[PDB]
Design an enzyme around this catalytic site. Structure first.
Site, PDB file in Angstrom:
ATOM      1  N   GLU E  98       0.848  -1.191   0.000  1.00 34.52           N
ATOM      2  CA  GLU E  98       0.000   0.000   0.000  1.00 34.52           C
ATOM      3  C   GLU E  98       0.886   1.245   0.000  1.00 34.52           C
ATOM      4  O   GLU E  98       0.659   2.183  -0.759  1.00 34.52           O
ATOM      5  CB  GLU E  98      -0.883   0.049   1.258  1.00 34.52           C
ATOM      6  N   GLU E 128      -4.083   4.891  -1.434  1.00 35.07           N
ATOM      7  CA  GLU E 128      -2.992   4.053  -0.951  1.00 35.07           C
ATOM      8  C   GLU E 128      -2.494   4.566   0.391  1.00 35.07           C
ATOM      9  O   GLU E 128      -1.957   3.805   1.195  1.00 35.07           O
ATOM     10  CB  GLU E 128      -1.845   3.996  -1.968  1.00 35.07           C
ATOM     11  N   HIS E 131      -4.935   3.121   2.759  1.00 35.39           N
ATOM     12  CA  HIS E 131      -4.723   1.683   2.893  1.00 35.39           C
ATOM     13  C   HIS E 131      -3.510   1.363   3.751  1.00 35.39           C
ATOM     14  O   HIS E 131      -3.498   0.364   4.475  1.00 35.39           O
ATOM     15  CB  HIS E 131      -4.611   1.051   1.503  1.00 35.39           C
ATOM     16  N   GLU E 193      -2.756  -5.479  -8.655  1.00 33.30           N
ATOM     17  CA  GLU E 193      -4.119  -5.244  -8.174  1.00 33.30           C
ATOM     18  C   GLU E 193      -5.212  -6.031  -8.894  1.00 33.30           C
ATOM     19  O   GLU E 193      -6.050  -6.658  -8.249  1.00 33.30           O
ATOM     20  CB  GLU E 193      -4.439  -3.741  -8.229  1.00 33.30           C
ATOM     21  N   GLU E 227     -10.859  -0.246  -4.648  1.00 28.78           N
ATOM     22  CA  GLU E 227     -10.168  -0.872  -5.772  1.00 28.78           C
ATOM     23  C   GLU E 227     -10.703  -0.654  -7.185  1.00 28.78           C
ATOM     24  O   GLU E 227      -9.944  -0.767  -8.148  1.00 28.78           O
ATOM     25  CB  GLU E 227      -9.994  -2.373  -5.513  1.00 28.78           C
ATOM     26  N   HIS E 230      -8.789   2.036  -8.840  1.00 32.11           N
ATOM     27  CA  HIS E 230      -7.421   1.665  -9.167  1.00 32.11           C
ATOM     28  C   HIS E 230      -7.390   0.737 -10.378  1.00 32.11           C
ATOM     29  O   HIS E 230      -6.451   0.776 -11.174  1.00 32.11           O
ATOM     30  CB  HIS E 230      -6.761   1.017  -7.945  1.00 32.11           C
TER      31      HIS E 230
HETATM   32 FE   LIG Z   1      -4.356  -0.204  -1.837  1.00 29.87          FE
HETATM   33 FE   LIG Z   2      -4.835  -0.213  -4.958  1.00 28.83          FE
END
Ligand SMILES: [Fe+3]
Ligand SMILES: [Fe+3]
Ligand SMILES: [Ca+2]
Ligand SMILES: [Ca+2]
Ligand SMILES: [Ca+2]
Ligand SMILES: [Fe+3]
Ligand SMILES: [Fe+3]
Lengths: 166, 511, 388, 388, 511
Positions: E98, E128, E131, E193, E227, E230
């Protein structure tokens, strides 16, 4: 039709109310109703399960009629019967202040409600009365509240003792 | 100097007492025998903004738990059936207490003349709104995610069918707002909250957790964090009127009346919901009561106010004397009248009877046998054509409703109080179950004119009342209330109609 | 102990096993919607409505109530816990009102909390940024400390006017709306004091004591009629609807709006004062939020009631005329403040145009809703008489 | 199903029993404090430090790192993932920095969210309250739309100047602070556009398109030197520290602070504009928040480093001088804007006083920290020479 | 028209693309072979303030559940011992992924030229960061309320002791930020990811739930909600360079290298943590892996990018052949070197051995017999003087570290891949475990000079390395790491020192 919220008694009174087309007749019927069906001094307990609701319906009609008949000043300061609200309020409070005991006091307060409860008397004056009359009623009633034995209190109230158990 | 600076709540509160000003008509609009001192202060120095922040923080943790982890854990389902039913009553009944407390504190806010005392009551006005919505949320959550939504989803209208609701309105609705503002404060704060709700709320979380309910603890524990403020308000009410001559004359009388009012309903009802509405027991009601009413409240709390003239309620002794069997006597009635509820009830099972007998010697010989017979009569089975109410009729055991407290009682069967006073006055019959409630009515007849379920339902067939007041499930036939908590063989409106049960007013037998 | 002594039914193997065995195969009713019987105001029932409507245990004899029978305990004398007798207004159902913002307790404290925390951030940035340097000294020490300060008592009195309503409102939705309208008023009064306390911290010699503002309010001339009106609205009105209606749809809509928006919000910026406007922005946000609820209750629900529309408008027109006079007197005395300003601050034309904005907004948002025949120029002319 | 198919170890009787049976009687270590080995900046270690310090896997060869060895994968050519070679500044430990406000992700988005939601409410109150009626049309259609809007590209440019720092920062505490400094800048840029978009909704002919303000920024004259200073701080500087230092402790502290606080926040109020100051209050709160961080890193940590105090102050004084010129040049070009103001808006006396407030605040908050000898009189004189 | 009006995120984002302007030096500061179109758009129309609000809402639920209900349920304790240990690695190792993702997207933000594409990456930069703090919080919470805080409380430094950490940095630290921005995007977004991270996060909550862990699901399920943004960033990265002629020339090779890099570590490591770090199982890793890499990623996901010139990695078939026994082969090494970890490991119990054999025919005859041999010899008992590393030396089974991936491997014992390539270059020996990693080093020797544990610890006595890197618990004597998860008979530094274990560089045997 014997329901809780809808029944023949309530229907019957809605019809009788629908026939009150003038303020004076309507206001007189409302006051008569209150003498006949409200408070523990009611002339009869026959309408016990529906009087609260019927009274409200009668009030609605008297209110609508009063707003139509009264000019703005009178709607605010006169009773549905044409009395000066302030005069009635002050006069009733004077009586209350002169009451010799809690028995006289309770009759003055209860009688005031039966006769002047809105829409008879303007709400502002009526609740000002509740404020003042209730204060004296409680003061008189709560003084030495437990001194009188139940045996004697039953007699003062004037109940008929039907059955006692213990 | 340009150092980062701001202003907090206490800094503003410092000048709050000065916000009120004098003028001829600056006085309370409500009737009262007392005079709250103009300089009364408040314990907590809050302002609107800070109050909102501290409650907002609590809400986020509460709703966060409810919407995330508890939902993922299926917490609304994994609760014992009996308790899911108990919470329908507990959460909705407390809700009305919370609700009326809003109006009650609005009335106290009006009564107080000192800006700081008004502000203390104001914070409770807002807290009671929060609590109303919180109790509502518990029912809302159990309805949305639970094993039986009926009752949880419409208690606000289905509670009107039964007799237990009437008594709740006396102590948690009308007792909170109707009368001298101080008398109301006593019912609500000095007695209601300090003696019952405060301890009750915590106890409920214990009983809930023991029966698999983690929803109620999440909300009720959050409700409990706001109570310190309310206790202070109640205590402050006493301080504000202590220096007035009226206080010596009236305080203890209003307090004694409030104590009896609250105790009359909670002594039997709370113990009943706890012991009979649960699978796993936490503590016998008897010992829970003694500690609450006698030790904590009637001892510690009440004692601190002795310096202000406050005294132990004179009816305290009678209260304890009538307490022991009270809840046991009431469950017999609530179960007998099970078709008038909005929740499902269960007969004590063998394991429970042992617990009852162990903690209340003599329980089996009286209640145990009765329940066993009703079971034999098939009270749990829809085809039996039997409702415990028939048993009361067959055995000439009339059930009366106290005119003042609304609490149902059967003097000919109760192991506790068995007194009955019947009076006729101006064309109406009135039945009382104790000497304190009787005095209340004789002295203040116009305050207590509540019609009981028998008066209102007189001559009505049972199934018609239930149908009219919407006591049915979404299918439109199965009853919300049930005489057992199993998922099969649920009673229908037709099963009740076939019983041909017609209410009658028991007092009419008197000449 | 690491595990603890209390065993929980949700996690304790033995107890959970007992609970799981007693569970039915599926819910005993598929209707999982609490409040399903409530008539939705919008498309679908809202959480606001579900958690609020019918919380108040009214019986059918109080319009819209679902219960039956008399109250269990009434006041000495017989007065009901709640009753039709506490207000002149009538309706087919007291539960019809809906706060257009759908505010129940949680959303309400959430927003106020955000405003509180941001206020603290703003003040820390304002002080650290030294923006006070550019504020006119006279405006600060005279108009903010004394006159804006005195206005806190106006808002405080309006707050107090809601005490009886918190006790008498005839429905849950109305009680909640009323409580929030009142709570926002005390908040504003406290934010006015908050600003004075802040200035005392960043300006040497500035006294945060309320003695000066309070003396202005209680014995000054500029706020004399305003105070007289507030004392009346608060303590001489025993009808909870006359109180809320007259406060929000008459007095505060005319006097309040003029003071906050047309005087302080309009002139503070001219004296390098970006501080006061920060707080007035909150007061105006609150005012507009309450307006939506006030309009819904009095116009949508009562003034347009299917059975009592004509009756209710008659009563509200009556109340409007009753309180418009004291309100005009309040604005009239306030006109006296303009003469205290440094020459060239504003003029009669600007003042007049600003009066018309308030009056025209009031006619549009309130007066016209009940057919009250307001004469914009006659109202303004009566107020201008107060200009010294 | 009502119970679901998945069995959870916390609630399933069988599984939970197995788990409980395997648990020790008590924790296998009494030290339950995560990040216990971190040196607390304050009395006790804070959640902010525990959750942030040492998240970056630096080896000991990067001042402060706790790991060992080279990186597992490097750039083609051999450049390390992170390395001392990315900044001129040196230190005994890159993890010493601490945001005075202790902001990790949660508190950060909580605060900005509150601001977003209050902004929404404020805008709804402003529009409903008709406060736009008292705003000067020329100030709006010309200075807010064109000149204030053009400044959005200045903020946007400063925002982007952080891109490389996000990648090269040599520590977690520094990366977080940097990321937040830049995010607040883009927020300001988007708030400027938000206001223009709002005005577009409540003002019939207002065009929200960025065409006008962009052309002013790209080809105009008022922001010529400003843009050149921005394009340089962003795309011509490859040292992440020189970028953050110069942007926050030089350019934005002088140019940015003057435009926001001394021009718009000071004059907007004079045109009946409380809208723009609402958003500038945010920008200033953000500026003051970031300042505390910028100060802690370059002064408390770097400029006062137990081993490189002298070295770093030299590098920064060098940077201060390098960018002080383009900055003063930016302030000069901006002066030409006062000539566009309607006659009587302000005077050279006020302006001179506003320039000294910026320069004096800058000297007190930045210049004097690294012992950079700046001359207030000459700087003001140099800038003031831009007045047309 | 004074209708309440406002402006939303979409209304501002409408003009976000025009925020960027043209000028000489307006270009990426990082080396790259591709060109991102300056008119590339982003999928989600967000501005800084709206982003903050949507994340703030998620935070309140998460932390609300963690601080309230979950803590009240003792959720931090009632977790199986093995899983409490597994989360020390999962959460902290994921944390660095992360964290470097912050810098990675920071590098991508600098690479994008279109304002919208930059804004897309920017959103991830902040995500991130959230996270990193979320994974940190999981360790923080387990340290605070769990059965064994050691490791959870200091992983950031104790992770540097063991070999598994080295490979983690390759796929989730250096692989994310060192190289062509686009290559990094492929390691992070397109492969990391989309192929692993996304499916893994949810899988982790499933294994966690099965083993009593409700803390991890609460946090990880929240992380998962971010997510989609991302995934889009990764997809848009390809669309962004699809037109650049360089794409056809380099895209598929950077992707193949990216695919191999990521799968090389997770194929063995994730299956190991899941199957060997738990008591209760969710699904056999072979089944899981095949679905993730072949069905979902290699098929559906890579398929949608076909129109942009993207093709299945050429090393895919190789990955599948090397996969089957990969995680089983690795645990043997991880357990043998248990003293180098920061967590406690357990040998499979009887039920687990039956589960492994049932799901992986042949497991018992190889791994099972070995674990039973080690256990009978006393690998769990500190007085045995036995650590499985001694068994490897005794039976001549050298353990090497791949110079590129850092993944440990034992060709002489492996049931899976057993290839080995050893080279010397300018006075340095290098060991490789596959043909793809070998090519990487040969073509880019200066990108891979990571010293392995044998090289750093060469000549050092085991207990000294542990003591020096603080691999001890509070009492300063007991090891954090353990060869069993029971509460008694924990190994101490002295128990290790007495083994007189001294590290040797295995490659020097070819000299
Ligand atoms: Fe992440
Ligand atoms: Fe991510
Ligand atoms: Ca008779
Ligand atoms: Ca005067
Ligand atoms: Ca003029
Ligand atoms: Fe409460
Ligand atoms: Fe309370």
């Amino acid at each position: 039709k014997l329901g809780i919220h809808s029944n023949d008694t309530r229907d019957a009174w809605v019809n009788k109310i629908a026939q009150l087309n003038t303020l004076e007749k309507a206001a007189e019927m409302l006051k008569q109703f209150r003498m006949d069906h409200t408070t523990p001094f009611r002339n009869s307990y026959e309408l016990d399960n529906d009087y609260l609701w019927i009274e409200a319906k009668l009030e609605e009609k008297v209110a609508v009629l009063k707003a139509r008949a009264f000019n703005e000043v009178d709607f605010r300061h006169k009773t549905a019967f044409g009395e000066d609200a302030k005069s009635v309020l002050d006069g009733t409070v004077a009586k209350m202040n002169a009451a010799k005991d809690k028995w006289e006091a309770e009759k003055i307060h209860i009688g005031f409600r039966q006769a002047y409860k809105p829409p008879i008397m303007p709400v502002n004056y009526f609740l000002d009365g509740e404020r003042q009359l209730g204060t004296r009623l409680m003061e008189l009633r709560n003084l030495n509240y437990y001194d009188t034995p139940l045996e004697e209190l039953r007699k003062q109230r004037g109940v008929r003792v039907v059955h006692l158990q213990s | 100097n340009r150092a980062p600076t701001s202003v907090n709540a206490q800094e503003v509160h410092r000048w709050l007492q000065s916000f009120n000003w004098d003028f001829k008509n600056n006085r309370t609009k409500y009737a009262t025998k007392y005079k709250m001192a103009n300089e009364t202060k408040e314990q907590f120095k809050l302002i609107a903004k800070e109050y909102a922040r501290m409650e907002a923080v609590k809400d986020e943790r509460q709703f966060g738990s409810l919407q995330d982890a508890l939902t993922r854990l299926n917490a609304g389902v994994r609760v014992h059936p009996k308790w899911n039913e108990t919470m329908k009553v507990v959460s909705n009944f407390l809700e009305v207490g919370e609700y009326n407390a809003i109006a009650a504190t609005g009335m106290l806010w009006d009564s107080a003349q000192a800006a700081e005392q008004k502000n203390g009551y104001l914070a409770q006005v807002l807290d009671e709104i929060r609590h109303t919505h919180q109790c509502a949320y518990v029912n809302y959550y159990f309805a949305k995610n639970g094993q039986d939504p009926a009752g949880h989803n419409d208690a606000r209208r289905t509670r009107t069918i039964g007799p237990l609701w009437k008594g709740m309105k006396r102590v948690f609705s009308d007792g909170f707002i109707s009368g001298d503002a101080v008398e109301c404060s006593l019912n609500l704060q000095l007695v209601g909250e300090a003696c019952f709700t405060n301890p009750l709320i915590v106890a409920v979380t214990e009983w809930a957790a023991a029966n698999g309910d983690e929803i109620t603890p999440t909300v009720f524990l959050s409700i409990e964090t706001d109570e310190l403020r309310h206790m202070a308000n109640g205590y402050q009410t006493v301080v504000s009127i202590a220096n007035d001559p009226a206080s010596a004359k009236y305080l203890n009388t209003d307090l004694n009346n409030a104590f009896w009012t609250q105790q009359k309903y909670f002594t039997p009802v709370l113990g009943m919901l706890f012991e009979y509405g649960s699978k796993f027991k936490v503590e016998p009601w008897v010992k829970t009561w003694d500690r609450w009413v006698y030790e904590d409240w009637g001892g510690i709390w009440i004692g601190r106010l002795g310096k202000y003239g406050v005294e132990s309620p004179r009816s305290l002794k009678d209260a304890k004397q009538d307490a022991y069997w009270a809840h046991h006597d009431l469950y017999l009635l609530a179960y007998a009248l099970w078709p008038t509820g909005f929740f499902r009830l269960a007969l004590p099972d063998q394991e429970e009877m042992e617990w009852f007998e162990a903690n209340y010697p003599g329980w089996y010989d009286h209640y145990g046998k009765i329940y066993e017979e009703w079971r034999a009569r098939g009270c749990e089975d829809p085809s039996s054509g039997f409702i415990p109410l028939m048993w009361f009729i067959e055995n000439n055991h009339p059930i009366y409703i106290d005119r003042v407290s609304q609490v149902p009682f059967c003097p000919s069967l109760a192991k506790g109080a068995s007194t009955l006073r019947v009076h006729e006055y101006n064309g109406e019959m009135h039945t009382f179950s104790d000497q304190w409630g009787e005095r209340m009515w004789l002295a203040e007849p116009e305050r207590y004119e509540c019609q009981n379920i028998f008066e209102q339902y007189e001559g009505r067939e049972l199934s018609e009342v239930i149908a009219e007041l919407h006591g049915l499930r979404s299918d439109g036939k199965t009853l919300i209330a049930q005489p057992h908590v199993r998922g099969d063989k649920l009673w229908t409106l037709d099963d009740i109609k076939r019983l041909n049960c017609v209410f009658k007013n028991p007092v009419k037998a008197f000449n | 102990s690491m595990l603890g002594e209390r065993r929980r039914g949700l996690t304790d193997p033995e107890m959970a096993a007992v609970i799981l065995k007693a569970l039915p195969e599926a819910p005993l009713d598929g209707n999982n919607k609490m409040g399903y019987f409530v008539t939705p105001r919008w498309k679908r029932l809202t959480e606001y409505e579900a958690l609020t409507v019918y919380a108040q245990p009214n019986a059918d004899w109080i319009a819209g109530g679902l219960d039956w029978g008399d109250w269990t305990q009434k006041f000495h004398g017989g007065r009901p816990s709640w009753g039709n007798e506490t207000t002149e207004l009538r309706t087919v159902d007291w539960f019809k009102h809906r706060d257009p913002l759908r505010r129940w307790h949680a959303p309400y404290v959430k927003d106020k909390a955000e405003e509180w925390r941001y206020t603290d951030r703003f003040l820390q940035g304002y002080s650290a940024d030294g923006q006070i340097r550019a504020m006119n000294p006279t405006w600060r020490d005279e108009f903010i400390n004394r006159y804006w300060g005195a206005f806190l008592f106006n808002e405080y009195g309006l707050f107090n006017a809601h005490s009886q309503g918190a006790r008498e409102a005839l429905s849950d939705v109305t009680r909640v709306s009323l409580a929030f309208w009142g709570f926002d008023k005390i908040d504003i009064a406290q934010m006015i004091q908050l600003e004075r306390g802040f200035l005392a911290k960043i300006v040497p010699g500035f006294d945060e004591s309320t003695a000066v503002p309070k003396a202005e309010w209680t014995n000054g001339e500029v706020y004399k009629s305003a105070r007289l009106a507030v004392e009346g609205l608060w303590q001489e009105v025993f009808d909870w609807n006359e109180s809320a209606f007259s406060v929000h749809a008459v007095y505060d809509a005319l006097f309040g709006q003029f003071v906050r928006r047309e005087f302080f919000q309009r002139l503070a910026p001219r004296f390098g004062d970006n501080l006061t406007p920060f707080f007035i922005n909150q007061a105006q946000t609150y005012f507009q939020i309450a307006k939506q609820g006030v309009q819904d209750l009095y116009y949508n629900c009562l003034g347009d009631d299917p059975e009592f529309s004509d009756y209710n408008r008659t009563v509200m027109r009556n109340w409007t005329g009753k309180w418009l006079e004291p309100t005009i007197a309040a604005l009239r005395d306030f006109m006296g403040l303009f003469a205290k300003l440094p020459a060239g601050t504003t003029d009669k034309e600007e003042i007049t145009a600003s009066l018309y904005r308030v009056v025209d907004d009031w006619i549009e948002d309130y007066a016209s809703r009940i057919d009250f025949k307001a004469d914009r120029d006659q109202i303004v002319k009566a107020v201008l008489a107060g200009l010294k």
